[PDB]
Design a protein around this ligand. Structure first.
Ligand SMILES: [Ca+2]
Ligand SMILES: [Zn+2]
Length: 192
């Protein structure tokens, strides 16, 4: 079968993701572990994800996000939001796990051939006083949702594409949507 690639590719623009250095205090709502290349966040809350490039991509560039199951045995299964959480910013499809917060230009796709879900936004260069571009994502199911992930790990793949859909870059990270991201990250790093 065919599955979405997760191969890292910096490409022509030196594209890679970055995350805030948030730490693991109990007050955190989103925190990234570099050692595990894993983002820990709460249900539907803001997840800042940074786009870092070495040179500016051309006008019309787009940034797409898609989720896939991490385990080989579940990778051909389309990642969708569970029925419970499906049943709303009025822009995102109810069955999509990943939404973009704070961007009216977000476009959602149900692939006509693979049936996979993704959300894409226009790439914008860093604002004045910043060296990266930040997109706010929201995950609409817990890793534990029996009706969807059911504790099966998932990866978010972020791809940079030109206006015509050509691949410019790719990066990815595992994601755990949970009640206590700080505590969960700290505990998972204890195995190291
Ligand atoms: Ca990376
Ligand atoms: Zn759910």
């Amino acid at each position: 079968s065919s599955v979405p690639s997760q191969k890292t590719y910096q490409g022509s623009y030196g594209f890679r993701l970055g995350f805030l250095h948030s730490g693991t205090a109990k007050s955190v709502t989103c925190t990234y572990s570099p050692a595990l290349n894993k983002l820990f966040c709460q249900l539907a809350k803001t997840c800042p994800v940074q786009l870092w490039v070495d040179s500016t991509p051309p006008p019309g560039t787009r940034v797409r996000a898609m989720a896939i199951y991490k385990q080989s045995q579940h990778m051909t299964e389309v990642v969708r939001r569970c029925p419970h959480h499906e049943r709303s910013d009025g822009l995102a499809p109810p069955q999509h796990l990943i939404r973009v917060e704070g961007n009216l230009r977000a476009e959602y796709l149900d692939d006509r051939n693979t049936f996979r879900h993704s959300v894409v936004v226009p790439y914008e260069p860093p604002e004045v006083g910043s060296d990266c571009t930040t997109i706010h994502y929201n995950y609409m199911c817990y890793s534990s949702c029996m009706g969807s992930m059911n504790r099966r790990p998932i990866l978010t793949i972020i791809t940079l594409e030109d206006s015509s859909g050509n691949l410019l870059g790719r990066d990815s990270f595992e994601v755990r949507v949970c009640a206590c991201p700080g505590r969960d990250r700290r505990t998972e790093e204890e195995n190291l």
